[PDB]
Design a protein around this nucleic acid. Structure first.
Length: 159
RNA sequence: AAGGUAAGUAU
RNA sequence: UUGGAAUACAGAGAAGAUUAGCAUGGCCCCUGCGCAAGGAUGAUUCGUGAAGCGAUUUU
């Protein structure tokens, strides 16, 4: 709604002169007297068993005030984050360029916009089977992203 | 003839 | 400390001058304050339970 009001250097300079003049006058007088849409990303990594990388991902999720989950399974790590656009962009730039995995590769499965946040805080869930992770994702209403990540992992393993 | 009144200040 | 004295006046600038220094302002380098903002990095016996280990008879 509001627009930024910028001026040229000369105009500013005139203001400075006036400002200093006013200041001098005063001095001389003192001496003389996440709502409306939240960005939700979901990335798929081959191996997330490293404690240092998981701690760095948890620190990047907690410092950016973004919620979500990090589910681990048999060669399928689904990291879902949700928050603002700048926090999601910083998390994607950290997980795509700063977080060095290497046969272990991390790629972003999906990145969209939702109405509100689903999870409360970043909880590192763990499940050896995919049915428990699917039930944990459906308990918070995010089973479609986990199913899409599992289908993308199956298509990457088959092809 | 002249071209040679200092001005100022209140009485 | 008393009391009073206090044409004339003044007169070529006095209708108070001349010269000079420092700071500030302004300008601009650096730095600081306030502040918009993105970028990437890093963290003695029996019974039961538990644990360890691994050549007489198929002539």
């Amino acid at each position: 709604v509001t627009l930024g009001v910028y001026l040229t250097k000369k105009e500013q300079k005139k203001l400075r002169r006036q400002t200093r003049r006013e200041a001098q006058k005063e001095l001389q007088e003192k001496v003389r007297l996440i709502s409306q849409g939240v960005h939700i990303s979901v990335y798929r990594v081959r191996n997330l068993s490293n404690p240092a990388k998981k701690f760095k991902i948890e620190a990047n999720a907690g410092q950016l005030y973004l919620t979500g989950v990090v589910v681990l399974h048999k060669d399928v790590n689904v990291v879902v984050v949700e928050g603002g656009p700048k926090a999601q962009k910083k998390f994607k730039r950290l997980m795509l360029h700063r977080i060095k995995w290497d046969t272990n590769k991390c790629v972003l499965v999906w990145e969209g916009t939702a109405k509100d946040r689903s999870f409360g805080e970043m909880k590192f869930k763990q499940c050896p089977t995919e049915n428990m992770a699917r039930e944990h994702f459906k308990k918070h209403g995010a089973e479609h992203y986990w199913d899409l990540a599992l289908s993308e992992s199956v298509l990457e393993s088959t092809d």
